[PDB]
Paper text:
Using genome-wide transcriptional and functional analyses combined with structural and population genetics studies, we conclusively demonstrated that a single amino acid change in the binding pocket of the glutathione-s-transferase epsilon 2 (GSTe2) gene, coupled with increased transcription, confers a high level of DDT resistance and also cross-resistance to pyrethroids in the major African malaria vector An. funestus. The topology of GSTe2 indicates that the 221 amino acids of the An. funestus GSTe2 (afGSTe2) are divided into two distinct domains similar to that of An. gambiae (92% similarity between the two species, with a difference of 20 amino acids). The active site is located in a deep cleft formed at the interface of the two domains, specifically by the interaction of H1 and H3 from the N-terminal domain and H4, H6 and H8 from the C-terminal domain. The active site of GSTe2 can be divided into two sub-sites.
These differences can be described as a concerted movement of the BN-GSTe2 H4 and H8 helices with respect to those of UG-GSTe2, which opens the active site cleft. Leu119 normally forms part of the solvent-inaccessible hydrophobic core that stabilizes the conformation of helices H4, H5 and H8 of Uganda-GSTe2. The H-site surface representation of both proteins with a bound GSH confirms that the resistant BN allele has a larger putative DDT cavity than the susceptible UG allele. An assessment of the DDT dehydrochlorinase activity of the recombinant 119 F resistant enzyme (Benin) and that of susceptible L119 revealed that the 119 F allele is 3.4 times more efficient at metabolizing DDT (82.9% DDT depletion after 1 hr reaction in the presence of the cofactor glutathione (GSH); P < 0.001) than the L119 allele (24.4% depletion). Overall, these structural analyses demonstrate that the L119F mutation is the causative mutation that confers DDT resistance.
Numbering used by the authors:
A (entry chain A): 4 to 221
B (entry chain B): 3 to 221
Amino acid sequence: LVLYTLHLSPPCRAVELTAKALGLELEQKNINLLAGDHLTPEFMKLNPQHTIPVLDDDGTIITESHAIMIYLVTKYGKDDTLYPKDPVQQARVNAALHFESGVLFARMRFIFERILFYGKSDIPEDRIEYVQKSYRLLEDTLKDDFVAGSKMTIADFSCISTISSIMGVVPLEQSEHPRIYEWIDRLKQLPYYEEANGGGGTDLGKFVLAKKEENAKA
Amino acid sequence: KLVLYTLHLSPPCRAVELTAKALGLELEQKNINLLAGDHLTPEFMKLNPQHTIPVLDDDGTIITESHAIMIYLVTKYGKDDTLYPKDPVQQARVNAALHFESGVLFARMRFIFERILFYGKSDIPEDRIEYVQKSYRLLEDTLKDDFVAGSKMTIADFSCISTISSIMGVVPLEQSEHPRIYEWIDRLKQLPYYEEANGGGGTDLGKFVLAKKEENAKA
Ligand SMILES: N[C@@H](CCC(=O)N[C@@H](CS)C(=O)NCC(=O)O)C(=O)O
Ligand SMILES: N[C@@H](CCC(=O)N[C@@H](CS)C(=O)NCC(=O)O)C(=O)O
């Protein structure tokens, strides 16, 4: 299994968490977004949307982190605990997956991408507010121990990959979000959490802040 | 007995309406007027703590979120899997397109529309327009086949067209640069239920956002 990837990228780290949970080894091929590696004609052939992650499973090309996670659990999970087959339980996981793509990740990207790639040095107040609203939505979703119920699923891997990044840029206040902090501690009990995700999320937040300051020059 | 907490102006609600028509299902609609804050009540919060529509009530079981609802309906009621394949590779292509709709097409539409509809804004910033125009290109390049996830129509087409048919009325979609998107829109327009389930509401939402933008300027 080959992952076209960059550790700073949240949906990349979502798939790394999944592969660790599944006991799969991934061969990582680095796509340096900061050098434009994803903008080549060769990469475009892999993904016409020119985004990472992309999985190569023995020549079969699977794009998009959520799709990749679902595919890996379906094909290689010894059971379905990370992505239930039961239709109602599965719908709850799917709903949380799309909440991650549509709300958590999208709002993070609306602050990050312009800093990382287009030379911006500001974070508009409305976009901070949009992120804080996404934190409230998440806190209210965490009625159980994990985002899509009492068992940990790929939806948690998706959500934490983003949360562990954006909170270093838009602070996530513990007194106001106790459930999110208890849930982060559950994920930090995983032996592979820091290698698969924690380090990379912390590093992305710091990088965004460092880039914002550097870009302020000239 | 399928009940949908819904508003016909809402894209993800029309994606589910298109899915129910394709499956031959009847939905009882319970109208949720977002402008009146019907989704922000304590009773609605119990249906969905994210307070979004659509929400499905299937004989007492609550299922949130349009893409989840579509997969659920095809899974449970499809006479075969053509709208959401069981094959893991073809399914992955559909899932990738569905998350493209939520993460890219819908998100960028909402980043223009929400502030006008609900928070009184009267402008559309140029950087937001570009974000949407970039999304059109991403979609155009995705459409190498007749439908967004291959040569067969799936729930990913319903999701994508419910947003595209809305945002094109506000951020114009230039035809000369996007022939594949126009050809695809015409394939969906051949469905006998397309206008009723989706078309009219997409057109109405676009005109409604432009009207409300004007209203907000005038106080
Ligand atoms: N829905 C996608 C989002 C992928 C995504 O946006 N990745 C970013 C990096 S975090 C990217 O590749 N950006 C480069 C580009 O959009 O051109 C997923 O979860 O795989
Ligand atoms: N990923 C969700 C998105 C739902 C969504 O944002 N719906 C809007 C109407 S188009 C809504 O209910 N907005 C009210 C709010 O967020 O408070 C889906 O596809 O169901």
